[PDB]
Amino acid sequence: EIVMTQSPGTPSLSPGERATLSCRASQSIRSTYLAWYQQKPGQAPRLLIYGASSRATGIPDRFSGSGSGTDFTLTISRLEPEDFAVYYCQQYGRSPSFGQGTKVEIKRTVAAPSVFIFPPSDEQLKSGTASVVCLLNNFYPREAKVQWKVDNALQSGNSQESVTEQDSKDSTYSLSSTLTLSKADYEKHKLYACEVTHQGLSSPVTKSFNRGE
Amino acid sequence: QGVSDLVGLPNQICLQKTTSTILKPRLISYTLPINTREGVCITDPLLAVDNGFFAYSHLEKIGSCTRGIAKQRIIGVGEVLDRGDKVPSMFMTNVWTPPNPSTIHHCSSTYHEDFYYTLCAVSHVGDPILNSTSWTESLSLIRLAVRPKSDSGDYNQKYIAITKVERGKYDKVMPYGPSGIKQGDTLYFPAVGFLPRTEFQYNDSNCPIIHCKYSKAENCRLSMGVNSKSHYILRSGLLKYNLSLGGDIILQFIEIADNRLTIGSPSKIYNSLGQPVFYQASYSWDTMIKLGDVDTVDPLRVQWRNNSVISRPGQSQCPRFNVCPEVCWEGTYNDAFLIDRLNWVSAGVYLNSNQTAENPVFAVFKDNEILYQVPLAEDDTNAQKTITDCFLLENVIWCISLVEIYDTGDSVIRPKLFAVKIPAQCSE
Amino acid sequence: EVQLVQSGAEVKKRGSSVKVSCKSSGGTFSNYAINWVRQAPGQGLEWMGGIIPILGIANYAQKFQGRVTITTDESTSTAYMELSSLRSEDTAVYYCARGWGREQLAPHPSQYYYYYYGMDVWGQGTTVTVSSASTKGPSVFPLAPSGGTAALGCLVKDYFPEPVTVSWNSGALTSGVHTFPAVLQSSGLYSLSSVVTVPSSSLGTQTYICNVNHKPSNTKVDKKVEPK
Lengths: 213, 428, 228
Ligand SMILES: *[C@@H]1O[C@H](CO[C@@H]2O[C@@H](C)[C@@H](O)[C@@H](O)[C@@H]2O)[C@@H](O[C@@H]2O[C@H](CO)[C@@H](O[C@@H]3O[C@H](CO)[C@@H](O)[C@H](O[C@H]4O[C@H](CO)[C@@H](O)[C@H](O)[C@@H]4O)[C@@H]3O)[C@H](O)[C@H]2NC(C)=O)[C@H](O[C@@H]2O[C@@H](C)[C@@H](O)[C@@H](O)[C@@H]2O)[C@H]1NC(C)=O
Ligand SMILES: *[C@@H]1O[C@H](CO)[C@@H](O[C@@H]2O[C@H](CO)[C@@H](O)[C@H](O)[C@H]2NC(C)=O)[C@H](O)[C@H]1NC(C)=O
Ligand SMILES: *[C@@H]1O[C@H](CO)[C@@H](O[C@@H]2O[C@H](CO)[C@@H](O)[C@H](O)[C@H]2NC(C)=O)[C@H](O)[C@H]1NC(C)=O
Ligand SMILES: *[C@@H]1O[C@H](CO)[C@@H](O[C@@H]2O[C@H](CO)[C@@H](O)[C@H](O)[C@H]2NC(C)=O)[C@H](O)[C@H]1NC(C)=O
Ligand SMILES: *[C@@H]1O[C@H](CO)[C@@H](O)[C@H](O)[C@H]1NC(C)=O
Prior knowledge:
The complex is a heterotrimer. Chain A is mainly beta. Chain A is about 5% helix and about 50% strand. Chain A has 2 domains: about 1-110, Immunoglobulin-like (Sandwich), CATH 2.60.40.10; about 110-210, Immunoglobulin-like, CATH 2.60.40. Chain A has helices spanning about 120-125, 185, and strands at about 5, 10-15, 20-25, 35-40, 45-50, 55, 65-70, 70-75, 85-90, 95-100, 100-105, 105, 115-120, 130-140, 145-150, 155, 160-165, 175-180, 190-200, 205-210. Chain B has one domain (about 1-428): Neuraminidase (6 Propeller). Chain B has 1 helix and 27 strands. By secondary structure, chain B is mainly β. Chains A and C meet through strand 4, strand 5, strand 10, strand 13 and strand 14 of A and strand 5, strand 9, strand 10, strand 12 and strand 13 of C. Chain B: Attaches the virus to sialic acid-containing cell receptors and thereby initiating infection. Binding of glycoprotein G to the receptor induces a conformational change that allows the F protein to trigger virion/cell membranes fusion.
């Protein structure tokens, strides 16, 4: 019944910088029962630190752990590229439990998205449902907002999203939004618009098509 | 000389509180037959030392200590002698091994001239404490010679089924504690009696709930059993065994008086500076250490010390230093040995933790202050039971302590043995 | 080195049970502990319980007490986790992992405690999906292009279960491709997109075909994407 809370939510650092992650316990624990793990996408976690300061075997020097009682800290003295991953803290013993995780991300300059709108394919309208897609391509940072307009009527609950991980070459993100209609309701409207807001965008950018032209 | 009972005028000890390490333990665990092997627990340990001899017992299981398969029970005796280093040590002379180790429970050793008499319970239902109704009272005595002889028949080792038990109003009685004493030719073993809740005489008004806002007057009585609705309550006392009687073998139960009554628990009666002292484990809400001079042996009444510094770890409901009546069965056995009656200085091992069994600390203490102490292990060291007996070696007060510890060197729960000289001077 | 090899992916109906296995492959369990740790997609790690096979004993997080059983076959050096009364909340990757485990003296006359230490050897994980939907291959729809740089794509919609694979021009086209994580829609079906960024003049010369493979239904669809 111990809770671990982790900080910061998502720091952005550069290769060669120093990362320091924090883990806070809902109640005091002996140092000997704290561990730190690393996880890259599509892989299992691997142990980095245990006993709150002891490096696991095979783990580079740049990883070090410290703290006591309620507060513990994991330090990467100087980041390498493969260090950009998710880090979990854990308390163990009678009923172990994890922190919620901290993702370390590559920092670069703000980059505005490119925006593309995709009307539904006729072949899908034949089947009775209609999807309209919005692509936000190669932006940074991760936070972007997609407002769907139909004749300037904004909706909710009918549009899903997805985001790629950081690009290995340029360190950007891309996002895809899918607004889903019944063919019936698609037939009933003319102007379909995507409105995108992002830190590299003072004025929101909008891309829209008029149905059937 | 050699090693003698702590009696007469022994060598002076620092009587003042100091934080500097003037106690240095000596490990003597290699002298007892604890043969480590991966995946075998060693539990139910027993230690007694009287008049330069000693008794020891353990049960080693394969796997867990609770649900492990009982592999071997051993009861042994020997002499406590000088290593050559003017340091006392155990040397086995005689060891007995029952044919079925899972059948023997709650052994207790009392020394008398040529032997250690070890009284044990026999059970086919497991621990009688946890299976009280199903246990048919059955007791054994293993008599072991401390100095075996060549062609002696049963002088070396004699087993005895007990067949006559006088137990008063109690349904069943059982040995409950590591060691007892002798008075003349009579032996006294620490013991417990099982009495049905229905016939337990107790006025709830005697429960001291007064400065405890969340304590109900029913709590003491409910805590006289290992749970609130248990069929029995448990009452500490002695099993008396008069050897002068001869013939066949009568054990008589003596209940403990109800001054500062707590649930029946593993206890020890020992002799120090020529008169008997009693320790009782705190297995309930009354968590400060329960020990003191015995006032009368029959009936049994202890002059409990008003000790405000030594306690024992508990769980969430009766943790260390708890003083208010609660309904709980929890705690550990950590006895102490009086080493100076005029100042009431004792030596013992306590677990320095609130709700965890760890950090064994050997400490010399009066009623209201710990004079000097020293750890016996690192600060996360799992450790539960401690038995401390003290004696003279060429008139220097020494104490030997058994501690059930988790040994990281072998990754195994097992007992360890320490010798500690009580220093005369108070500096470095 | 040891290796923990876990059982294969599972698709289970709402309300059923599942029994993942984990085999030790290169050393036995000797006195270590086997933990089970789950991870919902996008979410974090969550310790479910553990077993110490050289002792009898197994212990569980309170949240899973009752629904989770953890056992071993010590002879074949294998551990099992059985989760019953499954729901959508249990859709997750379930990992098996080894560490120190230890019995501990408790401050109690009879009780003992059980400590599970850090986990240094991990299995590859078992995906288990709890859904009522049935195996179904996707439909692929073009995302028509419409200088200086253009974007085109393929919508891979209404399939089950995971996964889908997408390539472009049989794998010859890789630069500028973004294949997005699948989304799960309220029909219980999955849907994802794959897009590619190309030169705007490149829309005249070259052709672009996306190759969608869905193994649970033996489905292969190549779809060309035209500027309409
Ligand atoms: C292990 O347990 C010890 C005992 O806990 C108490 O008993 C148990 C049964 C339970 O009831 C707990 O709730 C109790 O706290 C802990 O030591 C005790 O700590 C308390 C509070 O920290 C001490 O008390 C103080 O007593 C002093 C008397 O001289 C007063 O100065 C003081 O009064 C002030 O504070 C109270 C609120 O606490 C308010 O009324 C006012 O602020 C008032 O002015 C307290 O009453 C008590 O003396 C301690 N008992 C001991 C040492 O035997 C112990 O906690 C540790 O020990 C103390 C000394 C501090 O160092 C704590 O910070 C420390 O945590 C537990 N140990 C651990 C590791 O948790
Ligand atoms: C407590 O004692 C009971 C009473 O005998 C034990 O129950 C018996 O156990 C043996 C061995 O398992 C069986 O052969 C008997 O049939 C059981 N009797 C009944 C009435 O069920 C029980 O095993 C003991 N429990 C513990 C935890 O020690
Ligand atoms: C132990 O047994 C002996 C012998 O039975 C007891 O000694 C007898 O005590 C009674 C009453 O005190 C005397 O009348 C007898 O004369 C004694 N007989 C002998 C042979 O000495 C002794 O009192 C018993 N001790 C205890 C503690 O019970
Ligand atoms: C511990 O303290 C208690 C209470 O102060 C003492 O108990 C009293 O002792 C007197 C004798 O001095 C008896 O007449 C009373 O019946 C006892 N109870 C009371 C007064 O409530 C006890 O003697 C002290 N023990 C030690 C070893 O100091
Ligand atoms: C219980 O204690 C109170 C207080 O002295 C007393 O009045 C009452 O008679 C007692 N009851 C019994 C049965 O002794």
